[PDB]
């Protein structure tokens, strides 16, 4: 819509207060004109029609329970935009300031979130195993990162390229989580998963085996479930990324940590310059090694740590 | 689980099923939904 750029206030899924950028024209809309061509958040109203209605509020106060998923979808989309802009000089997911659209209250009892090629969508969860998924900044950034990947490498969502696609989303989801710097960790989706279990998550990057995901190439899943294991084999890459940043010893192989910023720089360059739709795990290794070489030089700690991390997870 | 209504099965898989009404735009193997 066209109106006056305003700042509203509300409460997110986890009960935290935050300010949100809105647009006033008769109603206050969840339309943030401060970032690129806009961040727009919609109500799917328990149905599956997308995008649904641009979120309209009478008073610019978003403190109702029903408002909470919208507050967080809108806010966290903004954080993710800022991350790509400020850290990687990338303007929205297409690098050309594409509008970022998100819909909440998708369907009923819907235990997932997605990118559909055009927008982000968040279920509310069944309330027992998930709460509304936009409550997790890592989850939001993971979905928008799928859009980034689409527009850059085009990693086909199947088999190894698809697991790389997934790991890229978990890597940058996590780096956006750290960038916001509230309660960051190397777990995925902890803030919206099993509200009656503390300490767990959907996936772990630090220890993928905690939830049955492989942490070494020798344990890769080669069947057909989950698009050839895209959310399973991502563990192998996630563990490599974790080791690159944090260091550690994994099946007896030590890796020197080079930190999150250098991890993000190496992987962003890999994704935008060296990966293609058919890239496999060995090709991702080559891409990350070449990226680190471009950025830091062949003799660098950074190059060596990328090699050691991929060795530690059995990717040659 | 169970999925015993006939010609169906359980999996933790992709977002799209085969639905008569939607086959023209999406199906199990041509699914635009990326989780």
């Amino acid at each position: 819509i066209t109106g006056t750029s305003t700042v509203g206030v509300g409460r997110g899924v986890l009960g935290d207060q935050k300010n949100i950028n809105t647009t006033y024209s008769t109603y206050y809309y969840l339309q943030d004109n401060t970032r690129g061509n806009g961040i727009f958040t919609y109500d799917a109203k328990y149905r599956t029609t997308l995008p649904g209605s641009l979120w309209a509020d009478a008073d610019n106060q978003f403190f109702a329970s029903y408002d909470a998923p919208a507050v967080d979808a809108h806010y966290y989309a903004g954080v993710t935009y800022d991350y790509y802009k400020n850290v990687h000089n990338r303007l929205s997911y297409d690098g050309n300031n594409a509008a970022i659209r998100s819909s909440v209250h998708y369907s009923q009892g819907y235990n997932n979130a997605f990118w559909n090629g055009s927008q982000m969508v968040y279920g509310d969860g069944d309330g027992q195993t998930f709460i509304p998924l936009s409550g997790g900044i890592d989850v939001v950034a993971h979905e928008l990162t799928h859009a980034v990947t689409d527009y850059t490498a085009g990693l086909i969502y199947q088999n190894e390229s698809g697991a790389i696609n997934e790991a890229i989303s978990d890597i940058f989801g996590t780096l956006v989580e750290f960038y916001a710097n509230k309660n960051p960790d190397w777990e995925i989706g902890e803030d919206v998963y099993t509200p009656g279990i503390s300490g767990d998550s959907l996936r772990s990057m630090s220890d993928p085996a905690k939830y049955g995901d492989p942490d070494h190439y020798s344990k890769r899943y080669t069947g057909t479930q989950d698009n050839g294991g895209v959310h399973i084999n991502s563990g192998i890459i996630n563990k490599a990324a974790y080791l690159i940043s944090q260091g550690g010893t994994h099946y007896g192989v030590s890796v020197v940590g080079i930190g999150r910023d250098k991890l993000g720089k190496i992987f962003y360059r890999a994704l935008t310059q060296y990966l293609t739709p058919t890239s496999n795990f060995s090709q991702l290794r080559a891409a990350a090694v070449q990226s680190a070489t471009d950025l830091y030089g062949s003799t660098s700690q950074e190059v060596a740590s990328v090699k050691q991390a991929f060795d530690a997870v059995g990717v040659k | 689980l169970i999925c015993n209504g006939g010609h169906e099965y359980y999996e933790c898989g992709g977002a799209c099923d085969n639905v008569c009404a939607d086959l023209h735009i999406q199906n199990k193997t041509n699914c635009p939904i990326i989780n």
């Binding site: 235990n111 997932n112 979130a113 997605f114 998924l133 997790g136 989850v139 993971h142 979905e143 995925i188 989706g189 959907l202 996936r203 479930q225 989950d226 959310h231 | 689980l1 999925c3 209504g5 006939g6 010609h7 169906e8 099965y9 359980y10 999996e11 933790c12 898989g13 992709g14 977002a15 099923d17 085969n18 639905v19 008569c20 009404a21 086959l23 023209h24 199906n27 199990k28 989780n35």
Partner: peptide, 30 residues
């Protein structure tokens, strides 16, 4: 963010209005 715990129709089959998986050859126009 993760896989979907779902019932799927077998290849060759698709959900009718009733939600039953039937042969795709028995689907209607739309």
């Amino acid at each position: 963010i993760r896989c979907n715990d779902k019932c799927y129709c077998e290849d060759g089959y698709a959900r009718d209005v009733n939600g039953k998986c039937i042969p795709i050859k028995d689907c209607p126009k739309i």
